[model samples]
Target: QLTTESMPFNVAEGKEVLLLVHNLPQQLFGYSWYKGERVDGNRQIVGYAIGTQQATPGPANSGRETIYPNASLLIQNVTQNDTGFYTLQVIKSDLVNEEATGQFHVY
Candidate 1:
């Protein structure tokens, strides 16, 4: 099981924000970040870590997203379009886990 370490935050437009995630398992394979309901099927992936170093970007994160050492998701130059429910998914080896959801908005 995974958990989130961040709450809904108000980010300024044209700036960057860090959506922190914590309690990651010892072995981290990869992770996905979503801009809306995850079921929408279009999400971002940041996986150049332990298992396989393959990274993919979604429409909303094609060029302005990065993953931190602690598995936190970093979005740069946030705009109003970046406001919404942000979800996360993590995988370790053959085991995948769905983590908590956090919200973000531009002020």
Candidate 2:
């Protein structure tokens, strides 16, 4: 079975939100988190984490952030500018394929 989960959270203009992804396949090659559109042409990569790897803040995201190979996304000090649909894309390998997606809302 495959599943994904995140904690419900609320933040002011300059707060933080934490998202955790569980039940991830062990064969995972890399994970890419996107906000807004899913299509590569229209979407933006908010964060990404590879096997036993970590990522820093990207151009699309705000404040300090980190991603663990275990499949967790941490966003620090969220803002109205951070509101969007967050999608998770997992790459296994050329032979095996898998992916998972979800959404996030900010008030």
Tell me the tens digit of each residue's lDDT in model 1 across 2-107: 7664333878888888878877776656677766656334564444454455566665566787876566888787779878877777767757565667678888
Q: For residues 1-107, write the lDDT of model 2, one tens digit per residue.
A: 44445455555556666677776776666766666546352354544446446564444554455666666677766667666666666667663645555545567
Q: Which numbered prediction scores highest in TM-score against the true structure?
A: 1
Please list the C-alpha lDDT of all candidates, in the order they appear. Answer: 0.68, 0.59
Q: lDDT at 3 for candidate 2?
A: 44
> Where does candidate 2 clash, by residue pair?
15-77, 15-78
- What is the Cα-based lDDT of residue 102 in candidate 1? 65
**Best by the lDDT measure:** 1
Candidate 1 vs. true structure, TM-score: 0.76
Instruction: Count clashing residue pairs per candidate.
Output: 0, 2
Report how far off residue 79 is in candidate 2 (Å).
Answer: 0.7
Q: Which stretches of candidate 2 lie over 4 Å from their true place?
A: 37-42, 46-59
